[PDB]
Amino acid sequence: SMSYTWTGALITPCAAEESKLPINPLSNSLLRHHNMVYATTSRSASLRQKKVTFDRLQVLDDHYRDVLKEMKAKASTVKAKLLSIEEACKLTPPHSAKSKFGYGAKDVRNLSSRAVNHIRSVWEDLLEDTETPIDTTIMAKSEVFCVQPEKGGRKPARLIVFPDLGVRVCEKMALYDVVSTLPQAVMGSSYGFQYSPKQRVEFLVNTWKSKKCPMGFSYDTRCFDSTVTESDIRVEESIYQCCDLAPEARQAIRSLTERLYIGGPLTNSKGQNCGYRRCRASGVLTTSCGNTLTCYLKATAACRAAKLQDCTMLVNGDDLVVICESAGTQEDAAALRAFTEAMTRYSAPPGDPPQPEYDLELITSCSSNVSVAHDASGKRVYYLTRDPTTPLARAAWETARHTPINSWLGNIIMYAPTLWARMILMTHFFSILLAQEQLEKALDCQIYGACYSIEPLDLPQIIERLHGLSAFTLHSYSPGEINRVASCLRKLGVPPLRTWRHRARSVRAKLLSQGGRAATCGRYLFNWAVRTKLKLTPIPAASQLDLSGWFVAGYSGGDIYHS
Numbered sequence: 001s002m003s004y005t006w007t008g009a010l011i012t013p014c015a016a017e018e019s020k021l022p023i024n025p026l027s028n029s030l031l032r033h034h035n036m037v038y039a040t041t042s043r044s045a046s047l048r049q050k051k052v053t054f055d056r057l058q059v060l061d062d063h064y065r066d067v068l069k070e071m072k073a074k075a076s077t078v079k080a081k082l083l084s085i086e087e088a089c090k091l092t093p094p095h096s097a098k099s100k101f102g103y104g105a106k107d108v109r110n111l112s113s114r115a116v117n118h119i120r121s122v123w124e125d126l127l128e129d130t131e132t133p134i135d136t137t138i139m140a141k142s143e144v145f146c147v148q149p150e151k152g153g154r155k156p157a158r159l160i161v162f163p164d165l166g167v168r169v170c171e172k173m174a175l176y177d178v179v180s181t182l183p184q185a186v187m188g189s190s191y192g193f194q195y196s197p198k199q200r201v202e203f204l205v206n207t208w209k210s211k212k213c214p215m216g217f218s219y220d221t222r223c224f225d226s227t228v229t230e231s232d233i234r235v236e237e238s239i240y241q242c243c244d245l246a247p248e249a250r251q252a253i254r255s256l257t258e259r260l261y262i263g264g265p266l267t268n269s270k271g272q273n274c275g276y277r278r279c280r281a282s283g284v285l286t287t288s289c290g291n292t293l294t295c296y297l298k299a300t301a302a303c304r305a306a307k308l309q310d311c312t313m314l315v316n317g318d319d320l321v322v323i324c325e326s327a328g329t330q331e332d333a334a335a336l337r338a339f340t341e342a343m344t345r346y347s348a349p350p351g352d353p354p355q356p357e358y359d360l361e362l363i364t365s366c367s368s369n370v371s372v373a374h375d376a377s378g379k380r381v382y383y384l385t386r387d388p389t390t391p392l393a394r395a396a397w398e399t400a401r402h403t404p405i406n407s408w409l410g411n412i413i414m415y416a417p418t419l420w421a422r423m424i425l426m427t428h429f430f431s432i433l434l435a436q437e438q439l440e441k442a443l444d445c446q447i448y449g450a451c452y453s454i455e456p457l458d459l460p461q462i463i464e465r466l467h468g469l470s471a472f473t474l475h476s477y478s479p480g481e482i483n484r485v486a487s488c489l490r491k492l493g494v495p496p497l498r499t500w501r502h503r504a505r506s507v508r509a510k511l512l513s514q515g516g517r518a519a520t521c522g523r524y525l526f527n528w529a530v531r532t533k534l535k536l537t538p539i540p541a542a543s544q545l546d547l548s549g550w551f552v553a554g555y556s557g558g559d560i561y562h563s
Ligand SMILES: CC(=O)N1c2cccc(O)c2NC2=C(C(=O)CC(C)(C)C2)[C@@H]1c1ccc(OCc2ccccc2)cc1Cl
Pocket: 196, 197, 200, 316, 319, 365, 366, 367, 368, 384, 385, 407, 410, 411, 414, 415, 446, 447, 448, 449, 554, 556
């Protein structure tokens, strides 16, 4: 069967769509090669549609059934609570897509009569109706990238598939507790979204150093979402059903599985029948948990199939990394090829074939690799970094255009110890915010899929929790990391690092002059910029922070808001 069938109706935008980075004094001071930065539009959806649409073969085996039973066994431990309409509405992003039936997200959040009645009747319908496919909208997602030269040229838009707001709320009631509890209970330390940045590094390094002779690799599946079959989604349901559930939750999940998750009709922004999905929806609550469970299931089974020895794996939706015991290079290569063949049979064929890796720093997972610097006292300190091209492009875009999500802020938070986040992102964005007296103004970003509202002035204490004091004192980055950043900047026409130091000195002064919370940013975020460096003791209010819901689960596509 096919991931998708199409009527021929176009995937239509519902606004004007911007695709060229503007010429702007502020974005130009970050990045000069503006013609290299673009945003995807629905104009390219057609191309994505081809890519995402294919037939699937899935042959299951005993390794699969064994691993499933073992997961269900752990799932059986869970007891999951039904969320109230109150809690579920408060999880709705303030700018979430309005319902087709009058109300929008503000009315959900205010618990207005229209929204709540509509939500109750959607809920009743999930209990009464077992079969009717629920409708979904299909939109071309606008994301910013840098042009890739002789690599492809330009990326076509990604596609998001989501149900109406009413349903989205009813999903949270039935499932928010499950998707944010079950994956941990099932996969234990292999569940990626449980780790803060510092914890992810520890886990990767400890696992690596714990192996007698480590070999590692990552595995990129070609369109994970389109390769998810309806068996997979039913199997995923079977895991959920092992939870103690309130009866209304149980029916809700059941109806939601047959009616929404397993597949259904697609409609374009103009109300026209677009086609039919028989694979994972990118834009539902279970998308992240479902993908993580499925990736883990298939991957664990395929390990058993390839007889990889003492495997530790770390899964974040479709992103998967394995670290195991080497058995020699020829034999490591053979086992890896067998592993792919097993994934391929489970319907998770690779994008590019996986490459056995013997140095932890040569492994990329979720765009990231471990790298090494030293702290003030000079000790080696591992930390996660990435190629800064995409972040920098997105930052330029966000500096030029008001956008709902500030990826620059997310990148500062998640990649705070990196050379490029400290020297460029912080300098740039604190210089602007300072100029515009927006330091206190809160700003939306996403971490692990969920949406957070963060005040920039709270960044020092956030970074301390997420990374530890170390993140403000790192120096002597690896040659390879420095040169990646250096050439990245030449490519994009970002001023050289030398220039950012100069701009930082100015910014730091201006923050210290301001005193209070602003001055703390100056001291901590920009200590690297000065020669006569300040001693940095732990920030008191760091320990007072409530990051309770920050690194608990993944919610990519799931319409989730924290504050
Ligand atoms: C789409 C998505 O949810 N993710 C993702 C997955 C694969 C790839 C990928 O690039 C991302 N990207 C991002 C993620 C964010 O949380 C926000 C941010 C701005 C950092 C971008 C997030 C992500 C990023 C890194 C990541 O793992 C490596 C890492 C963790 C902590 C600190 C540094 C590195 C995992 C995820 Cl889910």
